[PDB]
């Protein structure tokens, strides 16, 4: 079966704000990727192997609102731009990519999977370029291989006059590394 | 929710339609020049192409359009009218071999359905089954490129 995804919004601005302050979220969780927001931005967090990961430059060192109040980060790596929290009760976790693979697929905040060709250990060309706006808000999102296993997490856009041609990502290896740090 | 694949039927047969890039595509061998029904009355086909066995009206209500393949993978997946996914190896522009042959009735009513690539993107439209003794071992289809030119 092919990679397919769908999005669902679980709360709006006002609920998000309250939940951010109180740190107590009691909403049910489902899925591998969680759409996440701070008071400054929205990005994504991918659950890989029981751990909910995201881009440090988005999460900073903040805690994640949970049904039991705030939850401190398990992992924090400023240099590899990673932060990890225990995967929220209810989420399903992806597993790292076995057998490398050159054909990657970026899952966006809008639940679109777009082809990406690996051009190195941390960069891939967009088979079909898209405006930077399209990629906005999907940092921390997963880069999948044809099997649905996480290869990396979206970090940066290689923009050219408002259009992203390539994308920089953090390889799953860096996760495993960050974990033993 | 919105679906990309519609399960349509004429007085004589039931088949499928796939909305790609704004148009609800299906096989000429099932619809012909028939119109698609709607709350406002019947709507005429935007395209017809007997040579390609392709026809398409404007996308219905409660539908969403598929995106054409841009990776060009040959590891396809067929979606039947029962929503089963069948992996298919692309042998050619309009040909593909099932990765596991199925009885002929397993691919029935699926004409017009989509043939997706690993990314769930449209690679083509299921045109017909190439069976042997009643076992569908391969599939025939209308690549999206044709729909892209026709439109």
């Amino acid at each position: 079966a092919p990679i397919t995804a769908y999005a669902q919004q679980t709360r709006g601005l006002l609920g998000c704000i309250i939940t951010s302050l109180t740190g107590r979220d009691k909403n049910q969780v489902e899925g591998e990727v969680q759409i996440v927001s701070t008071a400054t931005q929205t990005f994504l967090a991918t659950c890989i192997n029981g751990v909910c990961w995201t881009v440090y430059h988005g999460a900073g060192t903040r805690t994640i609102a949970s049904p039991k109040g705030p939850v401190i980060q398990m992992y924090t790596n400023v240099d590899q731009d990673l932060v990890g929290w225990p995967a929220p009760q209810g989420s399903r976790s992806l597993t790292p990519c076995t057998c490398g693979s050159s054909d990657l697929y970026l899952v966006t905040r809008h639940a679109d999977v777009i082809p990406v060709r690996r051009r190195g250990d941390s960069r891939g060309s967009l088979l079909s370029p898209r405006p930077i706006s399209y990629l906005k808000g999907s940092s921390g999102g997963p880069l999948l291989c044809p099997a649905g296993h996480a290869v990396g997490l979206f970090r940066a856009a290689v923009c050219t006059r408002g259009v992203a041609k390539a994308v920089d990502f953090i390889p799953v290896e860096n996760l495993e590394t960050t974990m033993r740090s | 929710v919105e679906g990309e694949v519609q399960i349509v039927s004429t007085a004589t047969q039931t088949f499928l339609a796939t909305c790609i890039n704004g148009v609800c595509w299906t096989v000429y061998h099932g619809a012909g020049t028939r119109t698609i029904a709607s709350p406002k009355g019947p709507v005429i086909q935007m395209y017809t192409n007997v040579d390609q066995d392709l026809v398409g009206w404007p996308a219905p209500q409660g539908s969403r359009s598929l995106t054409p393949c841009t990776c060009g993978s040959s590891d396809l997946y067929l979606v039947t009218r029962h929503a089963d996914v069948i992996p298919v190896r692309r042998r050619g522009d309009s040909r593909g071999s099932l990765l596991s042959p199925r009885p002929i009735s397993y691919l029935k009513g699926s004409s017009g359905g989509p043939l997706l690539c690993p990314a769930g993107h449209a690679v083509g439209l299921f045109r017909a089954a190439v069976c042997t003794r009643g076992v569908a071992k391969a599939v025939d289809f209308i690549p999206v490129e044709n729909l892209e030119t026709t439109m």
Binding site: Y6, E32, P70, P88 | -
Partner: peptide, 22 residues
């Protein structure tokens, strides 16, 4: 600071399905 809040989800484990009439 405040807490990161989950405002939605993206599900990949879903597979083709025939949308129910009701």
């Amino acid at each position: 600071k405040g807490s990161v809040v989950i405002v939605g989800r993206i599900v990949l484990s879903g597979k083709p399905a025939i949308i129910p009439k009701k």
